[PDB]
Curated annotation (Swiss-Prot), chain A:
Miscellaneous notes: Present with 2840 molecules/cell in log phase SD medium.
Catalytic activity, reaction form: isopentenyl diphosphate + dimethylallyl diphosphate = (2E)-geranyl diphosphate + diphosphate; isopentenyl diphosphate + (2E)-geranyl diphosphate = (2E,6E)-farnesyl diphosphate + diphosphate; isopentenyl diphosphate + (2E,6E)-farnesyl diphosphate = (2E,6E,10E)-geranylgeranyl diphosphate + diphosphate
Cofactor(s) demanded: Mg(2+)
Protein name: Geranylgeranyl pyrophosphate synthase BTS1
Kinase among keywords: no
Organism field: Saccharomyces cerevisiae (strain ATCC 204508 / S288c) (Baker's yeast)
Curated annotation (Swiss-Prot), chain B:
Function per UniProt: Catalyzes the trans-addition of the 3 molecules of IPP onto DMAPP to form geranylgeranyl pyrophosphate. Required for the membrane attachment of YPT1 and SEC4. May be involved in vesicle trafficking and protein sorting.
Organism lineage string: Eukaryota, Fungi, Dikarya, Ascomycota, Saccharomycotina
EC number(s) stated in the UniProt entry for this protein: 2.5.1.-, 2.5.1.1, 2.5.1.29, 2.5.1.10
Binding-site list for isopentenyl diphosphate: 61, 78
Name of the protein this chain belongs to: Geranylgeranyl pyrophosphate synthase BTS1
Amino acid sequence: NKMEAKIDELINNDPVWSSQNESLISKPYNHILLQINRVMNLPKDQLAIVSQIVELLHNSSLLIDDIEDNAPLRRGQTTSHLIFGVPSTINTANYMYFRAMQLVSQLTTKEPLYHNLITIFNEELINLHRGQGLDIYWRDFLPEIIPTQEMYLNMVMNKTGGLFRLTLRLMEALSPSSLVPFINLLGIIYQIRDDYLNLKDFQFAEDITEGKLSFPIVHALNFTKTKGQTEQHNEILRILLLRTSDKDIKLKLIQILEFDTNSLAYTKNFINQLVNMIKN
Amino acid sequence: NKMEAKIDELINNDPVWSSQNESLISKPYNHILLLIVQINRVMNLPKDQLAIVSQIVELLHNSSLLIDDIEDNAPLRRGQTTSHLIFGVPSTINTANYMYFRAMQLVSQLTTKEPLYHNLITIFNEELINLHRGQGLDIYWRDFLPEIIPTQEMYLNMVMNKTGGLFRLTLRLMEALSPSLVPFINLLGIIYQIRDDYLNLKDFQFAEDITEGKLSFPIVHALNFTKTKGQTEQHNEILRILLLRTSDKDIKLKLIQILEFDTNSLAYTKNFINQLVNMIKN
Ligand SMILES: CCCCCCC(O)(P(=O)(O)O)P(=O)(O)O
Ligand SMILES: CCCCCCC(O)(P(=O)(O)O)P(=O)(O)O
């Protein structure tokens, strides 16, 4: 009857999707929205698409990161998952990873080069997830595994390194005219400095509430272990396992790192040495 | 300088990742581990290629299920506790997304010919975009109810994107490799989804679709039917029960008997399914 006819039109056409449907799906993403080329020389408009790709990937990974860390704030406003819900926020971020994958074919149609660009995109997203996976495992299975400094730096080369290397590698492949080593050291300085300032700025220090194995915390645990300081080693673990928002307890942990282990000075010195490798 | 030398070797090499590290982040996926052949008797693909299409579709389907269960707050899958309740929502979201990109990587094992490779990756990308558009609408309607009450036509379009996505992904990759069945695979997909919604209630008559608050095919028919017939009290009671997110067995049976005797949504759904099967069989 009339029904068969409707079904018939439906199954012989592409799936139906409107601009109004698209706006519903983008609500969690729009909420978060609120120089190297001097060397590579890419045509200003090819340069725009790379910029759109990087922005899509960065903002989407942040939406997922805030759910994985149970975070209340980002860029000074309530997090998207607390407004639209965890379900809609996961699906929207994941949708945008595939929208970014689609902009790659707009960079070129040369079949050989296209394949290399997709391989770069695939490899670095695999590295970002392997690094984020290990950082989460250490935090959520604590005190099963306490990483060493060497293990921490390998995690950062995967995690933080992934999107820095992604941006740089796409640009070098497209250049009409390798700084990877330089971009790798830049990502390492950036991550250790972030961990350092999260504590020094407080002195909200949310890395303590989250129980993160940050660069300063890694130094402190291995220092107390090496010197046989049993009670202090254990006190650091107890406070991290509390998942606390209590300002007085966070200050107590910060005091151990400053007065017992000298971990803040140690980290300051480490960052300085890394910066010097470039300045000399 | 012992440092500077170490730092220099680190930045001049690829990132370090061990087999022990691979095993730790695979825990959520290994836990869930515990149509193609048919179709092939038309496409005639070689067995080596057929096996690769199969690993790809399995990777994508199982990873999708890990995320769907978080999105639905589901306590059980395949008779066992869900991965997010065992390993935590954080590791489970990360591991599922990691596997989406490992599946992408497998596509390059299907051929060494550049033009064919570009078509396979395009098909992959198109159907994952469609899967996410349909799941996005299904989640929005349920989480923001009663802001939007979908009609039968809006539901069917949501299913063509969602359930149609994986059925078309399998068939389209096979057709691209053969040395169209799409309309047929679209209808099989619609039949599959409406039958799943129907049986979840009929079997109870644990009807977890009710606990979840889902705008299922029978619930969509009931809300529009009560609106059309002016049954204001019954329309509002259906909404109230879905918004409770209840596990009470008497409350779930009360709603199913409203669809059986008051709106006749269960009989409507059974006949709708029969008519779609006839369009095929006949
Ligand atoms: C999976 C993307 C991770 C992006 C960074 C997340 C952080 O948790 P971290 O880099 O300090 O570990 P944030 O930059 O939000 O503090
Ligand atoms: C993005 C999720 C794809 C798989 C969904 C399967 C179901 O979510 P559906 O019945 O809602 O289509 P399930 O019956 O496993 O909950």
